[PDB]
Amino acid sequence: FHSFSFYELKNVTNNFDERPIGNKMGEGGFGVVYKGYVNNTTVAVKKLAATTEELKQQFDQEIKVMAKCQHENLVELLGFSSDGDDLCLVYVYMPNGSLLDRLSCLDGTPPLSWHMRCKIAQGAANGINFLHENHHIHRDIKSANILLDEAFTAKISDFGLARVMTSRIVGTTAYMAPEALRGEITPKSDIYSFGVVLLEIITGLPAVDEHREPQLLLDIAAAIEDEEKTIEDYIDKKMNDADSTSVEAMYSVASQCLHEKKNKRPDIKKVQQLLQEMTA
Ligand SMILES: CCOc1cc2nn(CC(=O)N3CCN(C)CC3)cc2cc1NC(=O)c1cccc(C(F)(F)F)n1
Asked: Which domains does the chain have, with CATH numbers?
């Protein structure tokens, strides 16, 4: 971890080339992620962009929680830049991008095997466990914020909103718990959001598709629980190694996570155990 010059980060991203394939790898609400090469390693450079004050607060927060953090299932922050006109965060490069992009087979990548999906589910849950052990709430758990390294190891990203009620309601609505949408801040909200990620993994479908019926993946769960559908009907067809048994084990974990009453949901510790029993 050390301070980078804005102009060094500009240089290694070809002046922040927004063309893909180009240096642009992804983007979100809080900025664009660029491929760079600094020191003697390939790096991800997140140039932050929209409130200018809230943006700087999310920047300082990310640094405060991740500056010294090292974990198997969390991204590694290598440094930052605030000396230029734009705020930049620099991470270790995740060559296999986001769980979302790999579930979508973006840029012609092969579909993730059920085996790969199970290990990624366990990894992410191990990442969320470490945060809850250290009394951190993520507040933005989703397939886009689960990155995959050279070995498809799950790495949780985005700690800008990482932390009771609140005034400014923040997060990705497709993944947010009912109480999180009301402004409640609790680690039980992360468990819910993880439940939506498990539905994405089982189905290969994004949490929200405006051109889909139903539009929210949450409804598919609701439809299955009301005996109209079975999970069997929504299992990702782009797999050859998926067994109904272990699929239903993961769906059972997803269902418990997606309980509308926060207190009925399992803790992250119970989620890990149920996901281990799934494979063991
Ligand atoms: C945030 C998603 O951004 C990325 C997308 C990526 N895609 N590809 C692969 C890729 O482009 N292709 C080309 C064709 N081959 C076949 C394979 C797929 C690697 C990616 C790495 C990405 N990000 C990071 O490394 C990263 C790491 C830590 C923190 C962050 C943060 F966002 F928080 F800032 N980002």
From this structure: 2-92 (3.30.200.20), 99-279 (1.10.510.10)
